[PDB]
Structures are given as structure tokens and as C-alpha cells.
Design a protein around this ligand. Sequence first.
Ligand SMILES: *[C@@H]1O[C@H](CO)[C@@H](O)[C@H](O)[C@H]1NC(C)=O
Ligand SMILES: *[C@@H]1O[C@H](CO)[C@@H](O)[C@H](O)[C@H]1NC(C)=O
Ligand SMILES: *[C@@H]1O[C@H](CO)[C@@H](O)[C@H](O)[C@H]1NC(C)=O
Ligand SMILES: *[C@H]1O[C@H](CO)[C@@H](O)[C@H](O)[C@H]1NC(C)=O
Ligand SMILES: *[C@H]1O[C@H](CO)[C@@H](O)[C@H](O)[C@H]1NC(C)=O
Ligand SMILES: *[C@H]1O[C@H](CO)[C@@H](O)[C@H](O)[C@H]1NC(C)=O
Lengths: 323, 323, 323, 164, 164, 164
Amino acid sequence: PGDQICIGYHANNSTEQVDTIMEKNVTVTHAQDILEKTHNGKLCDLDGVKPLILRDCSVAGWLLGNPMCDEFINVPEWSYIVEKANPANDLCYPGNFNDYEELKHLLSRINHFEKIQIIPKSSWSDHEASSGVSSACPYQGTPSFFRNVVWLIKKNNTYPTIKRSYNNTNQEDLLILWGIHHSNDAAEQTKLYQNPTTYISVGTSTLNQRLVPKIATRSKVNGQSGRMDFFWTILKPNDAINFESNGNFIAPEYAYKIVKKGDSAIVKSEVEYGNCNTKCQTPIGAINSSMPFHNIHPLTIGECPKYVKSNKLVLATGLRNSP
Amino acid sequence: PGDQICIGYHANNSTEQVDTIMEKNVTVTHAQDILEKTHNGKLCDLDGVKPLILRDCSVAGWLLGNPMCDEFINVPEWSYIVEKANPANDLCYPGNFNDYEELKHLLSRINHFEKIQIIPKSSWSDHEASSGVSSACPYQGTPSFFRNVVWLIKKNNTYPTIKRSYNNTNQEDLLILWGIHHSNDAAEQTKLYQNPTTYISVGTSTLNQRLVPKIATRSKVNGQSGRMDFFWTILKPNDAINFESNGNFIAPEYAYKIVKKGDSAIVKSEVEYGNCNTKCQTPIGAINSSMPFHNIHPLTIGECPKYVKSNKLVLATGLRNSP
Amino acid sequence: PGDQICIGYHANNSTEQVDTIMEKNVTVTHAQDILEKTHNGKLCDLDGVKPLILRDCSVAGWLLGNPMCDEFINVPEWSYIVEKANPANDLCYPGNFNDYEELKHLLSRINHFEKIQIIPKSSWSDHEASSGVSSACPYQGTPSFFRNVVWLIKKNNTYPTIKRSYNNTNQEDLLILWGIHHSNDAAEQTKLYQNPTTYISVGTSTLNQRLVPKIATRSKVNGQSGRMDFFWTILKPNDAINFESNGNFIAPEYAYKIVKKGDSAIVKSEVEYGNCNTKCQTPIGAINSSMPFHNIHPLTIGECPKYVKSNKLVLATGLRNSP
Amino acid sequence: IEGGWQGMVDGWYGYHHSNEQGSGYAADKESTQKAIDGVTNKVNSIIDKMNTQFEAVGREFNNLERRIENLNKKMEDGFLDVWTYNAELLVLMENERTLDFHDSNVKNLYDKVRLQLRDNAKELGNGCFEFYHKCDNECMESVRNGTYDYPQYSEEARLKREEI
Amino acid sequence: IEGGWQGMVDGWYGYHHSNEQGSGYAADKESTQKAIDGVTNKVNSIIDKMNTQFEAVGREFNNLERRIENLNKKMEDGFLDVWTYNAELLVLMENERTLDFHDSNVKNLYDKVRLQLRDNAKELGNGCFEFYHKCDNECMESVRNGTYDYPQYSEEARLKREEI
Amino acid sequence: IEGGWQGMVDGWYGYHHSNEQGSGYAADKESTQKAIDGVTNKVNSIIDKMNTQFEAVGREFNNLERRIENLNKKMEDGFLDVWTYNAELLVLMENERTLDFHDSNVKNLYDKVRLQLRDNAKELGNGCFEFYHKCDNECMESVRNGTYDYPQYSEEARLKREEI
Ligand SMILES: *[C@@H]1O[C@H](CO)[C@@H](O)[C@H](O)[C@H]1NC(C)=O
Ligand SMILES: *[C@@H]1O[C@H](CO)[C@@H](O)[C@H](O)[C@H]1NC(C)=O
Ligand SMILES: *[C@@H]1O[C@H](CO)[C@@H](O)[C@H](O)[C@H]1NC(C)=O
Ligand SMILES: *[C@H]1O[C@H](CO)[C@@H](O)[C@H](O)[C@H]1NC(C)=O
Ligand SMILES: *[C@H]1O[C@H](CO)[C@@H](O)[C@H](O)[C@H]1NC(C)=O
Ligand SMILES: *[C@H]1O[C@H](CO)[C@@H](O)[C@H](O)[C@H]1NC(C)=O
């Protein structure tokens, strides 16, 4: 015959397929998957910093010191917070937690607290503090009540008018929480508090509230016809907070200093901790990868690939490879 | 000469033009318009299910039983709800409908109601129910008032204290609505209700309100200086609702059981019904098409092509075709 | 040798580089930058219309007539409004300005006001108007108070019940503002106002409020333990507004007619005016350009190129040009 | 290349011969098919990837909720702008690729032929080859299906070249 | 192909001849025009399709409206990310197409010539043809405007080929 | 063109010769390199331009904040749809360009060779040239690196053509 030279290209046994606007399922020689699809199924630290797992406790249960949340009496710094969808240990008296979701959102820029005694429980000389207890709020079977907050009642037949104030002497914003007890009828009102017409009055530089208890008949929630609403504010460094009341006041004992402020969120996971690390965490598991995309879960936290709802993102790098 | 072979391509008389990043108005042999531009100008069913046309009635007028909305006393299931921009038959007493838009939005996941008598009008033995009437609310010229709600007044010179409660015995959330009458002066107050200082008190497991009538002088709206505010809540399956009042209470008679919960919205159309069908409806007309895009109207409902604000989306499929 | 013809292309000394998905820093013969990067560093008119520079005054300080804001006693039409981040001349009594941000947002569709006397200061025959003054609100060192609003007090030992109303006789919506004074204790209350239990009652066709002063002890803000809340409403053409009070009322004198309604916003600039023009303005400077993109500042106002966060957008138009 | 064949109804690309036995059009089956397979899935891919939309809503706000309402309004204008922009640049870009896809495929037919008959024909520079030799219908069929025998007409082509 | 002509100031694409009468550059009028018409509307299409933006706003929130404020903030970052992303990938993609648009157009000039003078010239493999024959200025003008007569120089080309 | 070389492990594009001294594969160093440089930065550009994302959040609403909640939900579905759409059409479009990038580069190798040996070889129409002449290993190396001397084999090619 005669000598020959030929122009040709690479082939192999690769079976990785790849797509095109005009062609589907095109076998290629080399390719890159960019869509990440795997996760470790666990909740992990972020950047060597553990999260804050309230197990069966809610943010309110934790901050007000629900008796079953004692394990969180003095937590340390955290990367994020994980809560269940329906924590069994929330409030123990039925009622509203005012601007809850805004409080919750505030804990998303906060990283660590410092629980401070703000007005001691033993200062209430003229009121009966220790009877701040109810069956609606169990502890260890025994009737108990929030630990971070005092339910004052009359001493003798007398609820003298309370007038207390606190000057934040610190350089950090501090989070204070208090409450009001809506009694059921005139009789309960008198037996608990003496005075028939009452008010809680709380004031800062920014805040000016006056709460009046709504005395009415209700349907029993947890076998309890009464209600209890809670409230919160941030007290700036050199501002003072003033309380005044002659009844139904659920006074604070402990407040929370904010140190420090950083990144966080509040994950609604049921998944357990796993002693791992990641810069990217989702509710259903962490992901230690390096890719521009993933399809794990929408609600992601940290520095994470773009969540996308594709099943496949594969870039052809090599050549058409049919045998 | 000599024999010839030629390489060539299709041509025709087609005049469909098509665009390119470098060339505009390029005549092509075959093309596909993907932008849908036509609609049937009518309001139609969705998937064999008619919508709920309140004609000149509003959602409030309908739910509270405004006398001119009688045609909607017992409607059946619906796909969506159509309301005019300014319904002539809304409230008949001037006043606020609390969290209206949230109520409205709730009817967007609801598909069908069941109007239930919750506390009969003939139970009010000690109060004058039937005089719950006013000129501000006409019916057939005659002075009337909402049908689904009772405006109680004193019997003899006595408005005894009302204490009624309802335990939802059903397995469906039910929607209850009540109201308060702000009178004009001390005299009107006494003549209607007897007691000078009054309150409405409504309670569920989640709700705890106490409403006090604002007695003041006002500008006449519809020749009426008084006002009337309304309120609503959802009552969960085994929860009970408690009412207490000694005046100015606009009590419920009928509530609405929710069955069923699905997809819906509230269209602001003036267009009339047309006995048609579609899976895609807009305020200005239905569209029975099959295309990735349309430019009919932004506010679309159902499974509808992507609204876009282009006038032309045409894909060239065939060849450049110049003669 | 033999004669030759060659096929070739343009070259030059151009050094403009351009990018590609496969190649970076590719020198080209001609190119177009489309990303705009320069601004005049000044605040300018829009379309021959100057903006409204409140210098150290805030929107509230301006509308209520804070004594240090006198230069804005009767401003003319404006294109937009520029405010500092922390104006030194806001309220002069500490307190809340109800729905402030909604008011602010309303001035974003407004272009010009007309300050109208709505109920003259000399009409208050039975109350002491001129003592509506305090040290918390300085003027020229002297104790003063808002100019557009009267702080009424008792004449003799008598604050008779105020009952005044205003029928908007104009064809424009007008903006009315009033306030309430929360005193510190029963003593101050009596000395200022006589009556111990008081209320402000304001009503339109749409509005129905009743304000009760919260008498409590507070932390001194600007050496002042008292508080003062303000309120506002729009009064439609033929509607009337009714006021009633027997104490702590901060009555209006001047209202604002709205003419006209157009485009605007509220820029938070520190930059000074520059006697320039633009159709596009940013907080840090105007831009007179013509390009599809810019990277100057996110918060832009007018008809402005798409803000983008790229450093470079350059389109190759000519040819690859390497020597 | 001088324009399209008004006379070719059989397909998208093809041939036109003329010889002593007369003349005729003839579309390429494979080439026309490949173009339709390609172009149609292009259309579908554009259409099918749009699978995104399902739910639909307006939304309602009162007079003291103008910030939220405006926020809602700008979200809708926001996504509308983006989606309008995409669809329009998707079409322009892709319509261009479609058009020179066709040019590329036509060129491939021209080249398949040019390789089979190097000096057996003259490239007129017009899309057509003037055969040096006589090319009967079967010789023509042969150049269309690739099964064309060059050496048969070799010296015939050479000898009748040498007439020039 | 070996690079661009620093010396061609007349246009974007063109020719360079050298013969006994000397040498010179000469731009193609049609080709250069077609490229400018194409490239310029590409630029405008990118710019004009942007017709979307009209209104502009920031937005203001109090201390108990941090969820809404963050929602507002993320909407703006959201659309900014998308619009940044588009503009950058629009440029890269389109700049590439622009560059090999030019390569394709240059290749078309080279091919228009190559078809007119098959064996009358040697393809140097460099962008240039070494004519077999003598090609006076008018012969050169003729190859530029397509109006070149091959058969004139036929045997001249053949006979002076046969010197090799 | 008839398919890829299972036997070419040295690179992406290259050659296969066969002669009296035997046979062998040989990849093009420059061409394979250019393709990797191009294809890899394509990948990175897609990946790196994504630099946009930093912060992350869900968000929480009560029972009387269903309008806001739905607004929040639609913002997330909104951007998800857009970002899903982009990534998928980015891949399809770009994968196509990648594939005929390779076809174009292979064609360039074929053309570099075809220009060097016009009538010294037969274009088989298959990716291969049947040399007219005897082409020893050094003659083959010469056609690969561009440094191939045509005139050496000129009349040899002509004379052994003339055997046909
Ligand atoms: C071309 O002829 C071959 C045999 O030489 C045959 O197999 C093929 O079917 C023919 N093509 C057509 C289109 O008939
Ligand atoms: C080329 O010559 C033709 C006639 O052969 C003439 O019509 C044309 O104008 C010439 N081209 C130029 C650029 O002058
Ligand atoms: C090809 O040979 C040239 C000299 O003719 C030499 O410079 C070059 O290195 C050779 N190519 C290879 C791949 O060795
Ligand atoms: C405590 O806070 C008050 C605010 O009430 C501030 O004025 C004061 O500076 C602080 N105490 C002292 C002694 O300065
Ligand atoms: C009716 O509802 C109440 C809530 O008040 C619930 O506890 C009870 O189970 C229901 N009635 C009965 C008889 O169980
Ligand atoms: C003034 O406004 C009232 C609203 O109170 C309106 O009814 C009336 O028409 C106006 N005055 C007169 C004299 O009409």
C-alpha cells in the first residue's frame, strides 16, 4: 500500500455522561461533577466552636429558667443554636411571650451570654417570694416555677408598692425579662395580691410600658385557667431600668449580659451531635466539601455552596468517548 | 459544459422573522413562538371547580352577613375568590376590621366553609337581641344589620353580665367573629346598654383580649357618628372560647367550619364569569395554552407560564430564508 | 521568488485587555468599558430641582418645628430629602414618634408641602398656651419648645375640657400631628393640668384613638424624666378631625397640605450640596454618565445604571492584538 | 451559499445535480435528521428546564403597611426583571447558535463531497462542483452516499483537464 | 495568522500583496463592515435589553423590626448577586464569541481567495499564497473583488509548476 | 473522525503513523496543553465567579404574620428558581462549547498537516492521509513539528502519482 499518518484524539473506558442543549446522555472522557450531594448526617461544630443544643428546651424555657432546663443554667460560648420543632419544655404557664421572634432573631447575632443577678431574690423583704410556685410548672414532680424570675405575692395581707431600679454599670447591653400574671377572678386576685386594681410599670430611656392584668374566665391549658405573659428589653450600657407595681408582677432576678456578638442562627434539627467540624452545616447534617453547588437542604448556615434543586451538574472537560 | 453537483439548503415563502445578538429581523424558514399573548377575557373555573364570585360584596360583608349579601348565606366549595376593587357592600357601620388582610390571606388556603350556629339568637333571654338594628345598615330600605352577628341591647333598664362559652366539638378549625360598638356619648351609652363602664372579654387557649369602648364625638360616616370594630379568631378542635361582657358586645350567632384547606387566592377582577375551564387564570381573563412564557398579567393564579414583559419570544428552528 | 498575496487583520499599540471564559487578560484592538466607576462626590439637583437638605435637623424636628430647625419653617418644592445618620436636632423631649418610618416613607411620594395654620395658638382662651415650654428643648439657650405644636396647661387652677374640630376645606390630603405628655408623678400632673385622670381622644372617618398618660418614674434623658409621644394622620379632602382632652394634650397649630405627590426618597448623606445636576444621585455623589452598569453605591436614586459589585466590565469589540 | 433551494421540499439540506440524463434535487437523510434531533431538543430543553413555577399569589396590605407593600412590590418587579432578561438573552444567543449550526452542517456536506473528488471536479466557488468527467445518475448517487469510486474517472478527469 | 498587520489602517480585515510593481495593504470593505454592524449591535443589545430599571429606594425600620429589615437586606443582596453574576458571565461568554467571530471572518477571506486560484498559487501555510504566476496590480485587484480569471494563467501556472 | 484512539495515552490530541519502520502514536504537546489551559479556567471561572454567597439565614414568624411569612417564603423560592435555572443552562451551553472546542482543535491539527503535503499525500476522507511517497520516521516527525520539507518528495510524489 502506502505510508499513512492520521489525526485523532483520546479515548478511554470512561462511562461518565454529560449533557448539552442539543444532546442528552453524551459519554465523555473526563468530567467534573460540581453538584455536592453528600452530608455526614450529624450536627457538628463550626470552626472548632460547638453549638448550643437545647435538647427538649425552648429559647424561652431556657432564658426564663424552666426547672427542666437546668442543664442550661450557665452555658458557654456557641456557634449556633439548635431547637426542636416542638420542644416539650417551653413555658409552664400558658401565655404570650411578647416579640418572641424578634428576641429569637436577636440571638442570631449573639454568640455568648453572662447570666447576672440583677435584683436578688432575698431582697424582697415585704413580699412573699418563695411562694412563687405552681402545679402548672412541675420540676421533679413537685410544684415549681421558672428559676430566673420571681412570682411575688403578698406578705401578711399586704402587697406594698414595689419601686426598684437598676443601673446597668457594665459596658455590654444586657437582656432583662419580666412578666405579668393574669388571674382568673376577683377572689384569686385578692388572695394572691391583696390589691384589686393593679399595674406593672417598666421604664428605660426607650421603653415606657404599663401593663394591667386582664381578669377573666378561661379554658384550662395544662389544667390551668390562668395566664402569664412575658416581656423583654435590651438595657444599654449607662441606662437604668425602673419597675413599679402593686400586683401581679413577675420580677426579674437574673439578666443576661451580651458578650459576644457574631454570627449564628437557630436550626430546627432533630439530629444529634457528632463531635465533628464544618464551615457549612444544615439541619439534616454537616457538609465538608468544596464545590460551587449542593442540593442537600435550603436552610443552610455558614459559608456554603449555592443550594440548587438539580439532581445533576456535571461539566465535560475531556472529549466525546464512544467505542 | 460539464456535469454539476451542488450543496444547498431549504427555502420557502415563510416571512417569520427572528432575532439574534448581532442581527435583528432575520427571516427564517421555520420558527416557534414561545410567548403566549391571548386570553379568553373571562373568569372561568379551575379544574372543573367554579370560583366564588362575591359580586358587590366584600369578604367582611360576606362573613358578617351584610343584608345585601344574602346570596352568599350558604355557599359551596370554591377554587378561588373574586372581589371587586371597591365593593359597595362592605361594612354598614363604619369601623375597623382587625387583622383583615391576615383573615383574607387565610382564605387563600381554604376552599370551603360550613356556616354553623354557635350560640342561637333566641338564647338571649335577658337582653334585647332583635333591636340590633340601624339605619346605617339598610336591607330593603328598612333599617337592618349584619345577619351573622347580634347587636345586643338592654332589656328593661338592665344589661346583665353575659357569660357564655363554646366548646368546639368538631374536628375542624372554626372561624368565629365578634365585634364592639363604640358609642358617641354617655347618654347613648346608657340608653343602649345601661352600664356606663363596660368591656368585652374574649378568651381561648391562645387568645386573651379585653376591649373597652372608646366613647367620643366623631364625624358622620354614612350619616353615622358611631363606630363598630370587628375581630376574629380560629378555634382549634378541642378548645373552648369564652365571652364576657356587660355592654357594647356584638355577639356571634354563626361561625364557619373550615372544610377544606387547599389552594386559592383573591382576585380583584371586574370581569364576569364565562362558564369556561382553565388551569391558569388571570384577573383580566383565563388562558388555555401551553408555552413557557406569557405577557398577559403579572397577578396570575394556578400553574401558569412565566409572566414576562417582552412583546416577542420566537425561537428559530429552521434556516435563513431570503429570496 | 514569486508574487504573493496575504490575508491578515488589524493591529495597533492598544493595551486594553479583555476577558473570556477560557482566557484571562487578552489584549485587544478596540474595546468598550460598560462599568461606570466615577462620581462627582457631591449632592446635586435632580432634573433642575434642588433637594431638601435638613442639615442637622431630622424629619420629626422639621415637621414639629424644633426651635433649631427654623430655617425649614417654610420650605419650597424638592426632588429628594437628605438627612444625616444621627441628626442633632430631633425631638427635644424624649419619647416615641408613632409610625415614624411609615411617615418617613410617605415623604417619598411627596414633593412639596404647604404649612397651614389649622387651629390658632391665640384661640386657647381658657388654657395657658405660652407656658408650653421646657429646658429639655433649648432654642437660643432660653427654654423653648416645638413651634408647630402647643403644649397646653391649666389657666388658674382649671384645665376645662377641650373640644375642637377641623374640617379640611381643601382638595388636598393634609398631614396633622399631635402629641401626649407623660408626666412623672401625681404632683406634676396636678400642677400642670389640674385633672388627675385624663385622656386625649382623636377621631377622623378612619381614626379612633384614645390616649391615656402613663404616669411613672423614669431615668432622665437629657436631664428630663418626662416623656412625650407624637402621632400623625392624613386628613382626606372633605373629612373632619375631632380632638377632645382634659389634660396632657400637645395640640396642633400647623398642619401640612400635600402638594405635590411624585418621586423622592430620603438619602442618608453627610456630603454637601454642589450646585450640580444629574438624573442619577447616590449618597456619596452624583453621576452624570451613560452606561448599563456602575459600582458606586447600592442605595441609588433616580434612573441609574444597574449597581453591580464587579471591578471590571469590558466588552471586546475589535481584534486580538499581540505584537 | 448563493441562497436556499426553493425547489428542495424533501429536507433541510441536500443536493442538486445536473447531467446528460437531466437534473434533480435530493435531500440528505442523515444530515436533515441530525439537525431536527438537535434543534428540537434545544427547544424542549429551554421549555422543560422552566419546570420551576408552581404556586401563585398577589398580596394585600393596609395603609400603615406601605414599607412592606413596597417591599412586596419590589420583589415582584425584581424577579420579573431578572426573568424577562434571561428569556430574551436566552433566545438571542440560542437563535444565533441555531443559525450557524445550519451553516456548519451545510459546510459539512460540501466537504464530504469535496474530499471524494479532489481533481475529478472544479470548485466553482459557489457551492457547486463542475465535474471534470461525465457523471451519470449512478455516479451522482455514489457521491451522495459516500460510496463514490475516484479511480474509475481518474485519467478521464486528468485527460480532459489536459484539454485546458 | 502569524499576527495582525500593524500596517493596515484602512479596516479590520484585508490583504497585503507584493509583486514586481511593489507592495501594499488593502482592507476588505464588505467584510470589515459586516463585522462592525455585527459587533456594534451586540454591544447595544446587551445595553438596550437592560431597559428594566426605573424606580429606586432604600428603606427604614425600627428596632423591633429586625426580621423585616433583614428580609429587606437579603432581597437586595439577593438581586445584586444575580445581576452581578449575569453581567460578568454575559461579558466572558460574549467576548469569546466576538473574538472567534473575527477569526471566522478572517478565515472566510482566506477561503474566498483559495477557491479562486487552486493550483495557480502555493499555500505557504502562513496566511499567504505564493502565486505561481506573475500577478500584476490588476491581477491582484481581481483576486480581491472575486473577479479573477483563472484560465488566463492556467498553463503559465502549470508550466512554471513543471519547472519544479 | 472515525472515533477516538483507545491507544493514545500520551495526550488529548495527536497522531498515528504507519510506515515500513512500523507504527506508533504521538500526542501533540502544544495542542493538548492549550486545551487543558482553556478547559480548566472555564471550570474555575464558573466556580470562582460564584464568590457571591457569604451569610445564611432561615426566619421565624407568628400566626398573625402569614403575609410576611409567605413573602419570605416566595423570596427564597424566587432566588432558588433563578439560581437553579442559571446553573443548569450554564452547564448545557458550556458543555456544548467544550465539546466542539475539541472538534475545532482536532480539525486544526488535520489542517496544519494538509497544508504541508498538498499533493504529496491522498486525503482518504477519514482523518488520515495516504502519503504518496515513502515517509520514514524522520519524515513523519517532520510533518508533526511543522518542519516538513515538501520539495524533497515533490517529483517522487508526482512520478508515483503518475503510476495511476
Ligand atoms: C448509495 O448506494 C449504496 C451502495 O453503493 C447503498 O447502500 C445506499 O443505500 C445508497 N444510498 C441511497 C440514499 O439510496
Ligand atoms: C473589482 O473590479 C470589478 C470589475 O472586475 C469592479 O466592479 C470593482 O469595483 C473592483 N473592486 C474595487 C474594490 O474597486
Ligand atoms: C521537530 O524537529 C525540529 C527540527 O526540525 C525540532 O526542533 C523539534 O524539537 C522536533 N519536534 C519534537 C516533538 O521533537
Ligand atoms: C447610672 O445611669 C444613669 C442613668 O440613670 C446615668 O445618668 C449615670 O451616669 C449612672 N450613674 C452615675 C453615678 O453616673
Ligand atoms: C371541651 O373542651 C375542653 C377545653 O375546655 C376540653 O378540655 C374537653 O376535653 C372538652 N370536653 C370534654 C367533656 O372533654
Ligand atoms: C365638612 O366635612 C363634613 C365631614 O364632617 C362633610 O360632611 C361636609 O360636607 C363638610 N361641610 C359642609 C358644610 O358640607
